[PDB]
């Protein structure tokens, strides 16, 4: 299985843009993504379990991000609303062993840019 991102861009000021990363079974494997700060800092955005539950956020983007997953197309659905001051570059990742827990992961995507 390989991960490929799509839907990168933030052209509309103050809008809500949808990023996704498809997988090529991935149904029982959890998924995460990392945003790149202008200072290059790797930051977590949102969390999904293997079953779709446990949608929590860190103390930076809490209460302003909408996240979902769909195993039929092996895709994630993330809405960006408060990243106006960031020319971010997110990349997806699949933690190994699947499940609702978290482990160390190595299969990494391709890299899609987000520009305003």
């Amino acid at each position: 299985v390989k991960l490929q991102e799509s839907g990168g861009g933030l052209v509309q000021p103050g809008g809500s843009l949808k990023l996704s990363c498809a997988a090529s079974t991935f149904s029982s494997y959890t998924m995460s993504w990392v945003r790149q700060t202008p200072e290059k800092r790797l930051e977590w955005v949102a969390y999904i379990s293997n079953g779709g539950g446990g949608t929590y956020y860190p103390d930076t983007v809490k209460g302003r991000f909408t996240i979902s997953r769909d195993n039929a197309k092996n895709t994630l659905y993330l809405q960006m609303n408060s990243l106006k001051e960031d020319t971010a570059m997110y990349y997806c990742a699949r933690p190994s062993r699947g499940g609702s827990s978290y482990w160390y992961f190595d299969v990494w995507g391709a890299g899609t840019t987000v520009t305003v």
């Binding site: 029982s28 379990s49 079953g51 499940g99 609702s100 827990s101």
Partner: peptide
Amino acid sequence: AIKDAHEKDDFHHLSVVPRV
């Protein structure tokens, strides 16, 4: 058995993640 056991249910609502 590992796939059927833990890779199908939601193990959230726990402060610490169950490392198996």
